[PDB]
């Protein structure tokens with residue numbers, strides 16, 4: 586067990602191992618500090634969870650986040666560098682700290698500020714799809730892909746972060762907000778049980794924005810956004826209507842006048858024809874018919890970068906805990922076991 590030291594920073598007590606030095610606050614579910622890790626030479630983010638075990642819902646969310654971060658081991662996905670608690674036993678266990686690489690710029694900064702060549706778009710979207718092939722192979726759905734959840738460094742290398750770990754609130758998704766502009770219509774409107782195909786819809790929205798410099802579907806509310814979507818991809822046919830489970834949602838769709846799919850070459854003027862082709866295969870209304878991550882990596886748009894011997898899949902991921910009903914102290918004990926069994930990366 587390492588030696589810990591205490592200090593108060595912006596009204597919060599931080600108790601951390603001596604290896605972490607020069608803590609500096611940098612910003613819902615916890616507080617974050619930047620620090621220098623003297624054992625590895627890494628510049629890191631240290632997150633202290635806020636009230637991790639205050640309710641059954643919150644204790645299960647703490648366990649879910651720690652299990653997910655411990656599993657992710659891929660070049661294009663955020664990984665876990667360390668996890669610690671100052672507690673010396675389960676009986677005094679109350680605080681959880683998570684350590685990751687400190688991230689600088691996100692894709693928001695790049696799209697708004699830089700001039701991107703087609704080669705930049707190829708490399709950035711290739712890396713998102715490479716990470717998604719890995720994530721989806723473990724039957725994990727990210728659910729919240731958007732530019733602020735994609736970190737990028739000076740060499741245009743990219744990492745996926747901030748997995749969807751709790752339900753977003755109704756208020757967070759209301760109005761003219763980027764939190765909703767990248768969501769697939771079937772989850773935005775609760776049409777049906779969703780699956781991993783929702784993440785490919787988000788990649789299409791991000792790729793369009795890199796090519797034009799503008800948000801693809803900037804709706805002022807749920808219904809305005811749906812109208813923008815259906816004007817581009819067309820209104821649904823009877824085949825997809827069969828798959829919408831809410832009678833009321835089906836009724837609303839049929840109240841709209843029918844519209845054909847638009848010509849994407851006349852929307853994304855001057856783009857690489859291979860980029861136009863890939864966008865038509867991602868932005869498909871019926872989720873059963875969208876291209877998958879593994880299929881998209883083999884598309885000719887990525888011929889410069891595709892290497893099927895360097896696109897790995899994940900170890901199996903057991904999510905059976907998600908249907909388990911436990912007491913707070915039982916979720917807490919499961920979390921404690923995962924903290925003390927952590928083994929750092931090479």
Ligand SMILES: Nc1ccccc1N1CCN(CCO)CC1
Pocket residue numbers: 626627628629686687688689736737738742743744
């Ligand atoms: N590779 C990478 C890709 C996208 C965004 C950021 C980074 N690095 C991670 C490594 N770190 C240095 C050691 O703490 C600098 C940022």
Ligand SMILES: [Cl-]
Pocket residue numbers: 587588602603604605
């Ligand atoms: Cl230490």
Ligand SMILES: [Cl-]
Pocket residue numbers: 662663664665686
């Ligand atoms: Cl990482």
Ligand SMILES: [Cl-]
Pocket residue numbers: 670671672677678679680681
């Ligand atoms: Cl503690």
Ligand SMILES: [Cl-]
Pocket residue numbers: 693731732733734763
């Ligand atoms: Cl964003």
Ligand SMILES: [Mg+2]
Pocket residue numbers: 733734747
């Ligand atoms: Mg985020």
